[PDB]
Design a protein around this ligand. Structure first.
Ligand SMILES: O=[N+]([O-])c1ccc(O[C@@H]2O[C@H](CO)[C@@H](O)[C@H](O)[C@H]2F)c([N+](=O)[O-])c1
Ligand SMILES: O=[N+]([O-])c1ccc(O[C@@H]2O[C@H](CO)[C@@H](O)[C@H](O)[C@H]2F)c([N+](=O)[O-])c1
Ligand SMILES: O=[N+]([O-])c1ccc(O[C@@H]2O[C@H](CO)[C@@H](O)[C@H](O)[C@H]2F)c([N+](=O)[O-])c1
Ligand SMILES: O=[N+]([O-])c1ccc(O[C@@H]2O[C@H](CO)[C@@H](O)[C@H](O)[C@H]2F)c([N+](=O)[O-])c1
Ligand SMILES: *[C@H]1O[C@H](CO)[C@@H](O)[C@H](O)[C@H]1F
Ligand SMILES: *[C@H]1O[C@H](CO)[C@@H](O)[C@H](O)[C@H]1F
Ligand SMILES: *[C@H]1O[C@H](CO)[C@@H](O)[C@H](O)[C@H]1F
Ligand SMILES: *[C@H]1O[C@H](CO)[C@@H](O)[C@H](O)[C@H]1F
Lengths: 447, 447, 447, 447
């Protein structure tokens, strides 16, 4: 079947600073909570870390030349906060700013629109030392960071995102302890989530006050769970799973309150949202779009022993990618329609991709399963657009094989293979497949 | 995840006469419409036919020994009508009856319950010569065939099905011309469908009058289509696709009328159901269960040019089996719940399986994709039972690689590989996987 | 180096009933706790069980022909208690006795000395229903079982063992829950251990009173741990690890008391040995030899969080077999010298072998790592004999690939490969290597 | 298990001049006894020699760039005596000095601490012509060589070793004839050993008098033998084996006498140590640390026919590296504790590695057995540190595949593969494994 995309559909790829850049000590870069985390034995597989990574601090010109031949129109990347403010400090590091000017000017030179993520998880350790996100002073620190970027790159960047995946920053990181700073305390995860939201609202307010160029949003990762039974309990468990990812952050922003179930759920667990006067108004600051990050879908049932959400995922026997995630693309269609409760808002898919670990064989990377994955999910994108939803663009995750957080370098998401021994880039078969789709601006599924 | 099945859950496998038996001219067997069809150039791939097939006319003792070591409780097979009545004639062939007594006694000897399909597509050619199913005299001919079987095998067979897949017999065979007798006429397909239904009702009536042992039903193949858009037209197109397979046959049987939309749809195309006084009452004869035959699911949209149902299937990019069908097991869960409109009736899954063409390599058939397929679909079966639906059993399609109708021998569905050059059986890896599940009476999905 | 063994050194192989026999419901066999355990979802990998196994209930004549061409002098096997007393009942099953007469007469016919293990873990479920080993009535039940065997096979069997691996029966099974009946209660594991010992003493007493032919002992599995540090705590942790396997059972038998440290350790955990008047005298019944079961060695340190013995094993980086055990044969030499605290007693190595999962390739099983393993351990055997220790024989574990308890059939220990789909035996390369050693009665290590 | 190393633990790699440098005739280099030896038919396998080798005389900048990306803190190398004094002559060769200034300045430029071995076996042939090490005039010649180096490289080198492996220089070379100059005379081996020791003491005395920068020691290779029996004779044989490597050189240095047993043993063989007045005082000159060179461990027994030490090694069946040595890392732990008889002295492991002959395949060297070897031995290092022993650093043997003395180029020890046809370096998989360990400063053993 032929799937023709809109003329002005925005095709891109996405990375994050700590996952690709390397040069973790170079040019006065301070340490982030992820440096600290990855430098701690037992936290990241094999003790991998983002010292070096893809060395994109030095190799960005090649990366941009490769993405320019991909025929892509955006590039989503994030800013290393501790390159700009090494202690989250108000003491600016000009060399850090100079790096992003080099990147952004190259992008703009190549007709590729920067899509800037300000926060992709690298809180300066200095700020974490004071309580980092659980401390409201970090709010003010973020707003200065954001403001500095808005002022420096005014007119060079037209698409901004405050935070990438608040659910991970808050709950995966501070309740489940899986990501830096690796805490396991409900109240702290709720505190972090709330303060992210206030810092987000204040940054969007500053954006507006400054008259900064472009449009600004936030990029939640988005859950989809479907009940095993037709029971009310299984239905409830899926609602909790879905809502904590998206609604818990999106209902404040759009509708001015946290999801009351969940507030009630967490209250049963003795945790309350630290809401201060004025906070909810700040958080409801109008935004221009959202980014949605999507990989997977699950079938869940109520289980009292299944974690703090008491929602158990059933292994339905589906095939899985090389990191263990089932592929079921309908979940993207379902959650995009779900999110229309907030209106027909502008949505960019700011992360979608698969861990497929194929290496270079006879000079190429025959990653047919990544093509298959992307094909399936791009059909759903077309499908939602054709239902009239304002889905504006799609960013493949990831340009490059990179540091996959707690999995280290073992789990490859790139459309370009990186040999971490040599730093040699080898575009995979999915890169050429994707080059054709973005260039043609249509997709064909064939037998 | 562990999926524990009911204590009295009925595990089996399924074949059909013309697909396995061979000996097509032996012991006075008359020709069927499928002999004729497969003997016609251009109808079946490579000119394959069911002369010989798996030679199960001669090798049934081995087949039963193999299925007995599978640990199975039923075996679904069909009766070759032209072995019993070579001209559909009232002139019985005792040698034909003797074959099925040999099979049935062996099954019963082995503690394996016969599950008898009377009609699995092999209408005597003699009857087709007079109009075959479009001629009401074929109704009377079928009822005598059914009656003969009820009388002969009374007390040896406790599970009966009148017809396997009426949609195929009627629409695939007489509208789309794909299966014998290969006609392309809407009115004839509707005539055939109606007369099958009357012949079904009359046979169930005779069953009851005779006091034959056991329970009797009918085994539709079951469609599931889900709309591409949220549009009313796409929704309509899926409704037509779903209903022609199941409702068109099941609404007469259960509720006493054909689906009125569809009646109206076909009337626009100038075809009317040849309903005679008393017909609908006959068809509404109470039955004890149904068999459901399921493989696949589709995403459809309205398309004026997409065949007589104007319903186009979208290639969504899903992986497909070796015959080209996508695997999406949720469709089984969905259609089973759909069918509850007729009440919580007893349902056996009387056909589910995958075309996976792996051959013997180092003495085994490493058909991991067939295991994967079956795993997925057995989860859904468990899922519906746990929703309280009366799903009573599951028959894997197929015991043996066999004659796959218009595809010939090219398309292998068996859990046991058959080398058609030698007739050597080699149980595939899925056979041993299935032996464990049926024996344990639980399934585990693992990473 | 050449290693010449004593003229009268006893070479053999070893199996256990539930691991090889199959026919779990045949001839009135009752269910054991391992039938129950393996039939419980989640207990054994893949839901494997010992229904069928190697089908040695039917195929014992082939097995004996194969072991007879191995040139072996003993065969260690165990008696399925529930074949003899299906409810542990006093109601004898003659068909069960007849099986072991068939096996034993064949062995004796072939000049192969039976080495009979009475208890290799298959307690009748009927007895477990009353508390099984935690209930002193099971003591009396075992003594009748033992007595029945002594009386029936008097003069046909000259080597007897009461219990195989008391540590597993007691602590692995009732404290760690890993083996049937899968309990996790210190007091119950101590109760079980104590009652095994009383049942052992009473059986040896009956043996003597009856004048039964031959010699009788018990076959502990034997731990060896060596401390990571030179610290007193690490030394203590290794002492606990070593002593619970051997001394906890051997000090009662030889010296008339339980190891006082350990008694004190378990008392801190609120568990006491249920010692009744007369018990310790019973347990100290003189025995003729012991069997030692050995696989592996560990380097341990004190760790408060490392289980009920607070003894942590360090992964020292050694290569491991396919079940994950490091090979360090010196541990056999060390523990044999350790056990001289009980005097220079007669010791048979009644189990030593490796899980090496090589399959049949070009008609053979090239299990070089199993040869390597056995070579290393047979050097140590020679080494202890040459130090003057009365090590009398060696039984390779196992004749056949078999049901490896909680690992199921996945973990192969056999010197003969069994295809569980066909039951075809294929002697591995280690079988022919071993045939040469036992026949020559010397070993050569070569570069 | 995680094994965290001390913050200031010194990671390195090690080479020797004649094994890597090549340019054997360049820049006025005189011939050494190893040039002569390797140029003699029958002495070195295949007639390989150290003309050319790794050509590190020319390629040192690449080697240093590679070791700098390894993240290493030291580099142990040796000085070619005949580059500096071609006839061992007092006539200095400035071009020879200039080479080591180029190397050392590059190392220092790269933040890599030189660890200088003065004598790694390349005695000028001119000196051997006069009796070479058996002649006391060679003592004086060495002290001038050492003094020249101390004076030239003062302040550029902070770690010095006088002699690498005195046991090899003396006994392997002059008793067993295996290494240059290939003599077989006990008295000459004892003479050589004694004179090495005097030359060592005098050089350390000069070091002190000059006020040279850094610390100075000597680097014995270290034997470990464990007795086959518990017999006094086997115990004696192991004591001789252990002591001739270490104690025979270390007891003079630390305690002021040769091991009296051994003195007595050699006296029975008619050889006496040529001790002159003042000699033992000279040899007892205080040193700052020792280097320990370790590969392997053995199980030995007394055998009258087993060489001049009458100590036979038993092939215990252990797997071996590609040069034929068994790997048993506990020997490192054992001998380090053994050496505490001299006090808790500072010990660097100045050579540990494995001959693993894997070549480049698909662009990499998959030397998993070298990683396994190093893993095992680094656990023991951690283990001794944690026992409180002052083990200060670890140098992998070897940076590069090189000339392995009598084995020639056939036996590869490198962490970087060298194609001797092209001189192309290819870092092996162990190089990247090691880069991670040294950089993280911890090791993890995993299943
Ligand atoms: O420059 N400033 O003085 C300043 C102060 C507080 C600022 O922000 C304030 O920071 C507090 C924590 O210190 C938070 O509790 C308040 O919610 C936030 F409005 C900002 N800002 O966000 O733009 C700026
Ligand atoms: O034996 N008979 O005389 C006889 C006749 C008509 C019979 O059946 C009749 O057959 C007609 C066609 O010939 C159909 O039109 C009728 O619907 C059917 F009742 C049956 N029967 O179905 O049992 C039996
Ligand atoms: O036949 N009998 O009457 C009989 C009774 C108790 C017997 O044994 C007794 O059994 C008791 C449990 O019922 C245990 O508490 C005693 O320790 C045991 F001596 C035996 N026996 O072991 O030979 C035989
Ligand atoms: O420069 N010198 O005149 C000189 C002489 C002898 C020297 O050393 C002497 O050499 C003798 C052999 O010629 C040895 O027998 C003596 O043991 C050694 F002290 C040294 N030195 O070692 O520094 C220097
Ligand atoms: C979205 O998911 C990918 C894959 O897990 C991560 O690598 C990104 O950092 C995250 F934003
Ligand atoms: C159900 O489907 C299978 C596969 O197409 C056919 O072979 C059977 O005959 C049909 F009843
Ligand atoms: C000794 O160990 C082996 C291997 O785990 C088991 O299979 C035997 O049953 C046990 F007695
Ligand atoms: C230590 O051993 C290695 C391997 O045999 C040699 O190559 C070195 O030169 C020696 F110092």
């Amino acid at each position: 079947t032929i799937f023709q995309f809109p003329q002005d559909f925005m095709w891109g790829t996405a990375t994050a600073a700590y996952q690709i850049e390397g040069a973790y000590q170079e040019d006065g870069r301070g340490l982030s909570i992820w440096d600290t985390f990855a430098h701690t034995p037992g936290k990241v597989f094999n003790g991998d870390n983002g010292n070096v990574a893809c060395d994109s601090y030095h190799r960005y010109e090649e990366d941009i030349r490769l993405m320019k031949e991909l025929g892509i129109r955006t590039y989503r990347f994030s800013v290393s906060w501790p390159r700009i403010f090494p202690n989250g400090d108000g003491e600016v590091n000009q060399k850090g700013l100079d790096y992003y000017h080099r990147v952004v000017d190259l992008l703009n030179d190549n007709g590729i629109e920067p899509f800037c993520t300000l926060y992709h998880w690298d809180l300066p350790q200095a700020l974490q030392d004071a309580g980092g996100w659980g401390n409201r002073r970090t709010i003010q620190a973020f707003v200065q960071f954001a403001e500095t970027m808005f002022r420096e790159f005014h007119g060079k960047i037209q698409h901004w995102l405050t935070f990438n995946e608040p659910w991970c920053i808050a709950f995966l990181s501070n309740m489940l302890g899986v990501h830096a700073p690796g805490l396991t305390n409900l109240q702290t995860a709720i505190d972090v989530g709330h303060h992210l939201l206030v810092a987000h609202g204040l940054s969007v307010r500053r954006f507006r006050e400054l008259g900064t160029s472009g449009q600004i949003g936030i990029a939640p990762n988005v859950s989809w769970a479907v009940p095993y039974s037709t029971s009310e309990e299984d239905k409830a468990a899926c609602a909790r799973t879905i809502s904590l990812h998206s609604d818990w952050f999106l209902q404040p922003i759009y509708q001015g309150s946290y999801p009351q179930f969940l507030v009630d759920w967490f209250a049963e667990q003795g945790a309350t949202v630290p809401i201060q006067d004025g906070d909810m108004d700040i958080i409801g600051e109008p935004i221009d779009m959202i980014g949605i990050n999507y990989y997977s879908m699950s079938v869940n049932r109520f289980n009292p022993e299944a974690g703090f959400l008491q929602s158990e995922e059933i292994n339905m026997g589906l095939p899985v990618t090389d990191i263990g995630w089932p592929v079921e693309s309908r979940g993207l269609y379902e959650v995009l329609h779900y999110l229309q409760k907030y209106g027909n808002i502008d949505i960019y898919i700011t992360e979608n991709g698969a861990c497929i670990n194929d290496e270079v064989v006879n000079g190429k990377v025959q990653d047919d399963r990544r093509i298959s994955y992307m094909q399936q999910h791009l059909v759903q994108v077309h499908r939602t657009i054709h239902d009239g939803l304002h889905v504006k663009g799609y960013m493949a995750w990831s340009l490059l094989d990179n540091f996959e957080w707690a999995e280290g370098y073992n789990m490859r998401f790139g459309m370009i293979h990186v040999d971490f021994r040599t730093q040699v880039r080898t575009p995979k078969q999915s890169y050429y497949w994707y080059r054709n789709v973005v260039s043609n601006n249509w997709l064909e599924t064939r037998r």
